[PDB]
Write a protein that binds this ligand. Structure first.
Ligand SMILES: [Cl-]
Lengths: 111, 195, 235, 231, 250, 243, 241, 244, 240
């Protein structure tokens, strides 16, 4: 049987300071016991001073980040270049993820 | 939902329906009325899968109430039961069937007769002097076989129903938290508040 | 006959131009935007004295920060209001925030030209959409059935509109208070209305940042009418 | 006359009157100018107001980081077409990781407008567009007419009194094409061009709308006190 | 590339006339004469094979068509409209009847189904009525022999005998004099040939006349043996020779 | 009367006047030609320089279908593009199913049936273009010309637009004076001349010559645009012949 | 007068669009003829290449529908090709579904039923063409069946179509009145083609070169068109007797 | 496009009438008269055939009186083909109601359904209305004997006696004159035939011209019987009442 | 599907199909609505051109939508059934989802919305019907009377009439109805409703129908004799 999911490993970490925030991730990409890449960026600048990472199954992670980046683009078009606040971004990402409630994006996301 | 009984006597139909609503480990409620008035002289009790039971009952209720306004007329218990049966018989070959068993107790104002219909989730209709759904019938039908007479009064019907409830309280494993009893006669539907 | 989406030789859509004529026949609606709020007022125009005038709902809430007044075939506005309210609430659901007044107006206006042979004809109603958001502050928009919308410092629509707009031309300045704007709407309504203006045949409303969109009570409007009469008599 | 009831009908001389009437809506629209050098491309648009209380109708729409247009005619039709361009620009990026070529963008607009001219029930688009962009082959300026005809140009103008600005550009051709690595001088030439289409009214601070795209310049729109420099 | 004619092309005029039906009836009037006569032991239907050219092989053009083994049809009016109706009539006899009940429909019900198709062309979107009148002769076990006329309107009437098309008025008067309720099939064929001779101008023989009967069961025409209940088709198209034989005793 | 107001209506003549009106749009357009040579075809077109502001060599009119077919048209330019877009879909589905690139006669009928379909209903307008197209297939070179009616034939030379009569006269001389045939490089030069000669009908505005060609020897049977030195050589040859 | 624009009845009971489609039939100004031999069916048609720029090899109104069926069209080429493509599709689909080659007369009926629909349904116009189908059918033998814009169709012993059809028709009528048979009593198709050309020459009163004619021949199990050189051979034989 | 040829069958005139409905009613005014008369112990349906020919096979013929179920019948005036479309729909609605509720359909419910179908053709779809007016004669256990009529507008009303088709003005005056509430079926039969006999455009009223039917609760043991009269039985009732 | 735009704007800004639908309402029999202090009364005209009618089974002019709301109308009868059916369905659908019967205002707004939709949908004409919708909201004793019309506008009325000669009866009501003191009792309200109809009806009691709706689903239709007593009392007082 075809299994649509995989596990590309990795680990990510968000920490919120007083007037800053960090989003860290390791750069290793794996499948089973093989290393795919020693430097495959996982944490992305999405514009509007938001950083994002969708760690787990890298194909679903890339798909989600790509869709959110695009969501930011269309948020500018549709609402007069308004800055997407982090709380708004979060709610938008909930709807992206829940949209595939019955065929999930196999990732733990942090912004 | 567990126990629903029906008994048709001389001049009325009596429906007894358990009050317990249990989900898994806990008894969430002990005062649940497992019945809907479809028309002034027709009452439907129901039991089956959670959600499906009420959704189906209220759906039938809305349709019979819609008929009553359109024609300014009450459908006979026979007609309401045939409508209900068809809905269930349609249901059983659906994507997701209604898992609901019903008793329809009604007083036919034209014929001046009480009528009790037993319909299961497959759409299996039968007119009976007394009926039950699920495990209730296993205990109660033998009692009713022994003690029933067609010319019984409503008070005799209620005493016979107490004897059914006592037997169920003695021998069934689940605590169904007693029954709400309702009488359907020429004057309409009323609830026996002390049972 | 002829296509519903047909261009005239001058380069205008016949149906859109004819719907604009229907809007001219409608009751007057006036909007005035200030730095203290936006005021929306309407002529009710009851067709008979037996008609209970409080049931005439020509001023309408879209969200807490967005109000709306209408003029023309007011039955056509119900599906536009419905769309606006849904758009406002739906955007709050997706983004956890109030929706921009411009973005709301743009959403309403997207319905306008969805007609052909979709709905069978344009809307026969113009809207004054007033609101407040954090980005562009207090705003008043005029939403037509052409699909176009203009922002306005002040605007009149309906039967008395060109008369009212010339009056708003002179009277409006950037330093208007809310109380001044209220009286100014009442003044210009009284001027262009056929029947004598009172609390039962005219309605006021406003939208402020603090309190949001509020339709005024008849008792509150009555006091502002009495205040207007005295200040006109004062010189 | 008898052959102008719908877009599906040719006249006896081979004309589509509904398309020509749509073309007329553009001439009624406010003037907008487009021009470019080898490094940058500039849109200059005279915005129109309803009256003194009203705002000035926005003429320039951004399609991507490297492309956008100015409109003249029905603004709702410019919104539909710009949204279509936004999507096509976006599809090129998502699927091919490729910025959409300005020439190919024109071809897409042409074909979208065309379908409305050959089928019954629909109407032509009632708007003209000036698309500017910077892609892998440098700066570009396009003129879209709702007949379907799209034309790559060094400079142009569309709208009311646009023939004045178009003549100026036709004289200035050899000068402004050489304005490389100097955005302010290219905008000046565009502002001087659009001035040839003015009568009675002059360029005020909330009247004028300018946009620019170029080599190391994203498509950005300048309105309000941002264009006071060029008045 | 759209069918935008979702509206009726047949509508009521101020006088209450359905114009397109009347005009269809006018087309039927111009058409060649065909007739039907019902006997006690059979029905006969007949028409003139009006050949469009002498180079044309008029045998290939069948104006008289078998619908079921016991039902036949003939027409007056537009031949192509008739041909497609015969295709639909044959099919509806199977789909709406034989595949349900395992037997062929009775004459009246098949007629009803044809009538329905013609009525729908009189009310549906983007179509004109059929420009034909049909004469459908048939037999079934419980109704016996029967003859029906079907008009462009969808209306149908049972007849003892009738004619439609060119010389119908004269032909119907001729049949009124000759018809009685004691006619044998041979007598009806003889009367059919006499009636049809009046409306024909040119040659009058088996090659220019098409004539079929609904009569006795023909087990010889069945094609197989071994089922006592299947006794063979009651419909039979008379040959060119069989017609000429009866024209000598005319 | 009223027979010319709706497409797909036969006049009492037996004519579809809306198609004949489409032809007028074609006759109004710029001149385009096609020349069949020994092992290929050559397409050329007149591009009117409306203004100095038009960027030279940029507003390309000739279109490629698949990799082996060239298309040029006169009339309503968008209608031509729509037809070529369809042609590309037809050529793609043909190659997808049958593997081989679409033969030119096969491709011609695909355009022919599509254009003809736009004369069958009142809900669509006929095409306002005559399209000259062709290329090299397994059976050799083929040139076609396709009208608003859906009518098309094979050609030795083809011409359409405002300068068609002038062009047709010139093409007819080439057919008479070269029965053994014309070379691909010759056909490019002659195509340039014929567009220059046909420009006397559109003589008010100056123009820009555009040529393309498919030839078995010169382009490996692929459609290519004539560019640079070979284009300038053809322009010089054309300029010399008019003087 | 919109009863003349679409296919609905006029007060007289007429379909004017059908009648005007018949007139479109003669727009090409080409005359066709079809005759039957013992073993064959021959169809000839005038070929007119007015333009010198035309490739004469591509100018044709005879179509190979299937291996056994040929079709000559009288009418404009776009409608002719519309009808050709459909007939080819129908003939191929028939073979696939029913497991034997579509008979000529059945294809004719099918195309006629399609033509009928255009006369009844308003959105579809009639095709302005007359379709003459020819084959050597395996059951019926040499076969000529003709369809028109009305949706009429019938078998023929011989036929002619075009502006001067009546002249050709009477010429053929008079020959068959002499011979008293339904066909050309001739063994080889080559001589049946010679008959066809000869009787068109007599009927039209014009001489033909090789490039003025176009010939189709149906034999058992194939239909084929003759080349210019095959026709030349035919013309030489006619002249030599 | 197609708009050019659209009659627009579902529009108001300036006066607020539906053109096609009015013209359909004009069509119906030329159709053979049908009369319904309701008595205390039954209903009569009488109707005049339109196409007198001696060669029409009358005993197997049905243009006027149709059976919807065992309890309900209709008399038709207008296009027979149109009526048959509606009749087969009404026959199905009756059986759908029987299948659902296990009770025969009440007369008004069946009538309303058909009337609603007719209404639909006047408000949407762009099609011509049905050129038919029905007289419904029926029985149910709620209202007993009922007479209704529907027309192409989709409006229906109940009646004690009613005519549709030709000469209804004259027919309705004669019925209004001689009808009484305590009337019986045998009297109503006589009234129906006398009314047709006077309003008919023909020279004389004969058996071969009529379709006749009764719905009686005068079957064996309190049931309801629908009698569609045979030609000979119509001939007998014409002699009995004294018309021939 | 049939998509044709039947309701469209004309050069003067009018939608003729909507206005011609109002002419169908003008043709319809007169209907009147009068709300008292603790009741609403719906009066309706029955034209006496139609005798030999069966008044038991003929569709009555006032229709119950639910047990607490009624709908009368003027205009095309066949069109009114469609609105009544949709309203009845929506009334049960409201009870099913909201667990509460409709308010009179809600039901009016729904019926009005259906009427509006038919003025800008392809392939349909407007309803040739205006309605009077009357009743009492659940657990409320304030009377409600609303009017709708083909365009889809709706509004609340102290008293209102629609249909033929509605101009005359509206004239009557405008002078006879006092807002400060409405008909205090059922008797007074029915009397004023009958009086107003007697201006137009021009015949005794067979041509008038009255339906009284009271709070808590108390709806009753008056008989001929009960109405005829009001007709007798009005004209005996008038002779003075
Ligand atoms: Cl077929």
């Amino acid at each position: 049987q075809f299994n649509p999911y995989g596990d590309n490993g990795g680990t990510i970490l968000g920490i919120a300071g007083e007037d800053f925030a960090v989003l860290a991730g390791d750069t290793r990409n794996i499948t089973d016991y093989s290393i795919n890449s020693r430097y495959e960026p996982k944490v992305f600048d999405c514009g509007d001073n938001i950083v994002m990472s969708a760690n787990g199954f890298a194909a679903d992670g890339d798909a989600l980040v790509k869709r959110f980046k695009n969501s930011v683009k269309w948020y500018h078009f549709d609402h007069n270049d308004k800055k997407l606040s982090i709380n708004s971004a979060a709610r938008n990402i909930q709807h992206l993820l829940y949209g595939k409630r019955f065929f999930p994006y196999y990732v733990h996301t942090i912004i | 939902m567990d126990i629903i009984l029906g008994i048709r006597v001389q001049d009325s139909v009596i429906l007894a329906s358990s009050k317990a609503v249990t989900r898994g480990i806990s008894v969430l409620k002990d005062s649940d009325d497992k019945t809907r008035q479809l028309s002034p002289h027709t009452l439907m009790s129901f039991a089956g899968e959670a959600g499906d039971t009420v959704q189906f009952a209220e759906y039938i209720q809305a349709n019979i109430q819609l008929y009553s306004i359109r024609e300014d007329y009450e459908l006979s218990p026979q007609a309401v039961s045939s409508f209900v049966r068809q809905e269930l018989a349609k249901s059983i070959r659906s994507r997701r069937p209604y898992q609901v068993n019903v008793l329809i107790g009604g007083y036919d104002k034209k014929k001046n007769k009480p009528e009790l219909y037993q319909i299961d989730y497959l759409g299996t209709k039968v007119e009976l002097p007394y009926g039950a759904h699920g495990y209730s019938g296993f205990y109660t039908f033998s009692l009713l076989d022994h003690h029933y007479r067609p010319d019984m009064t409503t008070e005799e019907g209620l005493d016979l129903l107490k004897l059914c409830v006592q037997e169920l309280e003695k021998r069934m494993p689940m605590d169904f938290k007693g029954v709400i009893v309702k009488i359907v006669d020429k004057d309409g539907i009323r609830q026996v508040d002390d049972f | 006959d002829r296509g519903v989406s047909t261009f005239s030789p001058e380069g205008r859509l016949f149906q859109v131009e004819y719907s604009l004529e229907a809007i001219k026949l409608g009751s007057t609606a006036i909007g005035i935007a200030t730095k203290e709020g936006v005021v929306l007022g309407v002529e009710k125009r009851a067709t008979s004295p037996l008609l209970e005038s409080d049931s005439i709902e020509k001023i309408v809430e879209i969200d807490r920060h967005i109000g709306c007044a209408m003029s023309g075939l007011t039955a056509d506005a119900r599906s536009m209001i419905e769309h606006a309210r849904t758009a406002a609430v739906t955007h709050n659901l997706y983004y956890d925030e109030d929706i921009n007044v411009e973005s709301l107006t743009q959403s309403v206006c997207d319905l306008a030209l969805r007609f052909g042979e979709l709905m069978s004809r344009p809307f026969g109603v113009a809207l004054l959409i007033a609101g407040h958001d954090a980005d562009d502050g207090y705003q008043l928009f005029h939403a037509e059935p052409s699909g176009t919308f203009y922002r306005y410092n002040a605007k009149a629509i309906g039967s008395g509109s060109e008369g009212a707009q010339a009056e708003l031309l002179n009277e409006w300045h950037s330093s208007l208070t809310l109380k001044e704007a209220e009286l100014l709407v009442l003044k210009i309504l009284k001027q262009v209305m056929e029947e004598k203006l009172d609390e039962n045949n005219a309605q006021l409303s406003c939208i402020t940042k603090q309190d949001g969109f509020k339709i005024y009570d008849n008792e509150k409007t009555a006091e502002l009418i009495k205040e207007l009469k005295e200040k006109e008599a004062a010189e | 006359n008898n052959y102008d009831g719908d877009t599906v009908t040719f006249s006896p001389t081979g004309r589509l009157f509904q398309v020509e009437y749509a073309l007329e809506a553009i001439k009624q629209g406010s003037v907008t100018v487009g021009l470019r050098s080898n490094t940058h491309a500039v849109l200059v648009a005279l915005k129109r107001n309803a009256d003194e209380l009203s705002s000035y109708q926005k003429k320039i729409i951004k399609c991507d980081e490297h492309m956008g247009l100015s409109l003249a005619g029905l603004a709702p039709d410019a919104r539909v077409l710009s949204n279509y361009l936004r999507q096509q620009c976006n599809y090129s990026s998502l699927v091919f990781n490729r910025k959409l070529a300005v020439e190919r963008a024109g071809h897409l607009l042409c074909d979208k407008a065309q379908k409305n001219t050959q089928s019954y029930g629909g109407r032509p688009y009632g708007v003209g567009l000036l698309i500017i962009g910077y892609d892998k082959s440098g700066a570009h300026l396009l003129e879209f007419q709702p007949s379907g005809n799209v034309t790559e140009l060094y400079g142009t103008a569309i709208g009311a009194r646009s023939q004045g600005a178009k003549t100026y550009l036709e004289r200035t051709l050899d000068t402004f094409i050489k304005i490389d690595g100097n955005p302010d001088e290219l905008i000046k030439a565009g502002v001087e061009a659009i001035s040839q289409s003015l009568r009675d009214e002059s360029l005020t601070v909330d009247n004028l709308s300018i946009a620019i795209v170029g080599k190391d310049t994203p498509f950005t729109i300048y309105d309000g006190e941002a264009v006071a420099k060029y008045i | 590339m759209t069918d935008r004619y979702s509206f009726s092309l047949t509508t009521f005029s101020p006088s209450g006339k359905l114009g397109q039906i009347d005009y269809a009836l006018t087309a039927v009037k111009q058409g060649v004469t065909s007739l039907g006569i019902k006997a006690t032991n059979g029905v006969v239907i007949a028409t003139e094979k009006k050949s469009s050219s002498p180079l044309a092989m008029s045998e290939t053009l069948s104006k008289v068509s078998l619908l079921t083994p016991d039902i036949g049809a003939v027409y007056s009016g537009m031949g192509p409209d008739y041909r497609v109706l015969v295709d639909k009539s044959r099919k509806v006899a199977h789909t709406s009847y034989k595949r349900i009940y395992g037997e062929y429909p009775p004459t009246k019900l098949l007629v009803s189904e044809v009538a329905k198709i013609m009525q729908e062309a009189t009310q549906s979107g983007g179509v004109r009525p059929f420009g034909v009148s049909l004469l459908i002769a048939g037999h079934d076990e419980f109704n016996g022999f029967s003859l029906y006329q079907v008009d462009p309107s969808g209306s149908y009437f049972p007849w003892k005998a009738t004619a439609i098309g060119k010389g119908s008025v004269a032909a119907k008067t001729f049949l009124e004099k000759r018809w009685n309720d004691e006619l044998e099939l041979e007598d009806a064929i003889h009367i059919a040939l006499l009636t049809l001779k009046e409306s024909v101008e040119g040659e009058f023989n088996g090659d220019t006349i098409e004539l079929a009967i609904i009569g006795d069961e023909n087990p010889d025409l069945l094609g197989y043996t071994g089922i006592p209940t299947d006794k063979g088709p009651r419909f039979r198209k008379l040959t060119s020779q069989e017609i000429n034989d009866r024209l000598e005793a005319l | 009367t009223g027979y010319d107001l709706s497409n797909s209506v036969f006049s009492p003549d037996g004519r579809n006047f809306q198609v004949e009106y489409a032809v007028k749009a074609v006759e109004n357009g710029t001149t385009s030609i096609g020349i069949k040579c020994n092992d290929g075809v050559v397409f050329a077109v007149e591009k009117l320089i409306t203004s100095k502001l038009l960027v030279p060599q940029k507003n390309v009119k000739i279109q490629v279908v698949d990799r082996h077919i060239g298309c040029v048209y006169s009339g309503l330019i968008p209608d031509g593009r729509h037809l070529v877009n369809r042609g590309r879909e037809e050529a793609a589905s043909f190659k997808k199913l049958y593997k081989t690139p679409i033969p030119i006669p096969a491709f011609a009928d695909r355009l022919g049936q599509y254009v003809q379909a736009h004369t069958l209903y009142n809900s669509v307008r006929p095409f306002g273009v005559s399209t000259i197209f062709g290329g090299v297939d397994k059976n050799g070179a083929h040139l076609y010309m396709l009208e608003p009616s859906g009518s098309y034939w094979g050609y030795k030379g083809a011409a359409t637009g405002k300068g068609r009569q002038s062009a047709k006269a010139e093409l007819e001389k080439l057919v008479d004076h070269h029965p053994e045939g014309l070379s691909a490089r010759e056909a490019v030069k002659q195509a340039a001349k014929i567009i220059y000669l046909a420009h006397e009908d559109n003589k008010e505005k100056d123009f820009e010559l555009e040529i393309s060609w498919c030839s078995l020897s010169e382009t490996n049977g692929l459609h290519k645009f004539v560019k640079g030195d070979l284009l300038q050589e053809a322009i010089d040859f054309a300029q010399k012949e008019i003087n | 007068g919109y009863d003349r624009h679409i296919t609905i009845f006029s007060p007289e009971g007429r379909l004017y669009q059908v009648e005007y489609a018949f007139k479109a039939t003669n727009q090409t100004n080409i005359n066709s003829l079809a005759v039957r031999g013992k073993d064959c069916t021959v169809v000839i048609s005038q070929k007119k290449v007015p333009d010198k720029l035309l490739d004469p090899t591509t100018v044709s109104y005879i179509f190979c529908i299937s291996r056994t069926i040929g079709m000559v069209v009288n009418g404009p080429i776009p409608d002719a090709r519309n009808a050709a493509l459909r007939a080819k599709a129908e003939a191929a689909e028939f073979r696939y579904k029913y497991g034997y080659d579509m008979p000529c007369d059945v294809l004719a009926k099918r195309m006629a039923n399609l033509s009928q629909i255009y006369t009844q349904r308003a959105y579809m116009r009639p095709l302005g063409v007359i379709l003459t189908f020819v084959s050597v059918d395996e059951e019926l033998g040499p076969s000529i069946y003709k369809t028109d814009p009305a949706g009429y169709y019938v078998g023929y012993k011989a036929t002619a179509t075009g502006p001067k059809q009546q002249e050709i028709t009477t010429n053929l009528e008079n020959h068959f009145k002499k011979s008293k048979i339904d066909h050309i009593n001739e063994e080889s198709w080559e001589k049946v083609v010679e008959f066809a050309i000869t009787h068109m020459i007599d009927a039209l009163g014009t001489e033909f070169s090789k490039n003025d004619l176009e010939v189709g021949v149906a034999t058992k199990d194939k239909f084929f068109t003759l080349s210019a050189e095959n026709i030349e051979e035919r013309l030489v034989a006619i002249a030599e007797q | 496009g197609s708009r050019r040829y659209d009659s627009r069958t579902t529009i108001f005139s300036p006066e607020g009438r539906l053109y096609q409905v009015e013209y359909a009613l004009e069509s119906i005014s030329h159709a053979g008269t049908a009369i319904g008369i309701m008595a205390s112990d039954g209903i009569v349906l009488a109707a005049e055939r339109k196409v007198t020919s001696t060669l029409l096979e009358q005993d197997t013929s049905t243009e006027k009186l149709y059976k919807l179920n065992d309890k309900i019948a209709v008399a038709v005036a207008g296009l027979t083909a149109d009526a048959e479309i509606l009749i087969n729909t009404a026959r199905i609605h009756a059986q759908n109601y029987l299948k659902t509720y296990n009770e025969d359909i009440p007369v008004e419910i069946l009538v309303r359904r058909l009337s609603d179908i007719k209404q639909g053709y006047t408000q949407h779809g762009g099609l011509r209305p049905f050129g038919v007016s029905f007289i419904y004669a029926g029985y149910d256990d709620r209202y007993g004997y009922q007479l209704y009529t529907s027309n192409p507008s989709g409006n229906y009303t109940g009646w004690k006696a009613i005519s549709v088709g030709a000469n209804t003005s004259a027919a309705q005056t004669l019925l209004q004159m001689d009808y009484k509430d305590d009337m019986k079926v045998d009297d109503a039969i006589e009234l129906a035939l006398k009314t047709l006999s006077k309003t008919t455009d023909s020279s004389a009223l004969t058996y071969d011209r009529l379709e006749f039917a009764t719905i009686r609760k005068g079957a064996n043991d309190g049931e309801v019987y629908q009698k569609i009269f045979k030609p000979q039985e119509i001939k007998d009732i014409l002699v009995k009442t004294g018309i021939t | 599907g049939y998509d044709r735009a039947l309701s469209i704007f004309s050069p003067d800004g009018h939608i003729f199909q909507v206005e011609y639908a109002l002419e169908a309402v003008k043709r319809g029999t007169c209907a009147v609505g009068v709300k008292g202090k603790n009741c609403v009364v719906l009066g309706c005209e029955r034209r006496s051109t139609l005798k030999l009618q069966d008044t038991r089974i003929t569709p009555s002019k006032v229709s119950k939508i639910d047990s607490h709301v009624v709908l009368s109308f003027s205009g095309l009868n066949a069109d009114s059934r469609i609105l009544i059916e949709k309203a009845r369905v929506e009334a049960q659908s409201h009870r099913l989802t909201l667990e509460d019967p409709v308010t009179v205002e809600y039901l009016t707004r729904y019926v009005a919305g259906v009427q509006q939709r038919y003025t800008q949908s392809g392939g349909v004409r407007p309803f040739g019907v205006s309605t009077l919708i009357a009743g009492f909201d659940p657990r409320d004793d304030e009377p409600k009377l609303y009017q709708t019309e083909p365009s889809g506008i709706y509004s609340s009325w102290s008293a209102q009439t629609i249909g033929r000669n509605s101009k005359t009866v509206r004239e009557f009501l405008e002078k006879n109805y006092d807002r400060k003191e409405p008909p205090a009792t059922v008797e007074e309200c029915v009397k004023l409703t009958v009086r107003s109809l007697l201006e137009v009806v021009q015949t005794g009691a067979k041509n008038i129908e009255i339906t009284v709706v009271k709070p808590d689903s108390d709806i009753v239709a008056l008989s001929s004799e009960e109405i005829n007593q009001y007709v007798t009392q009005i004209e005996q007082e008038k002779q003075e």
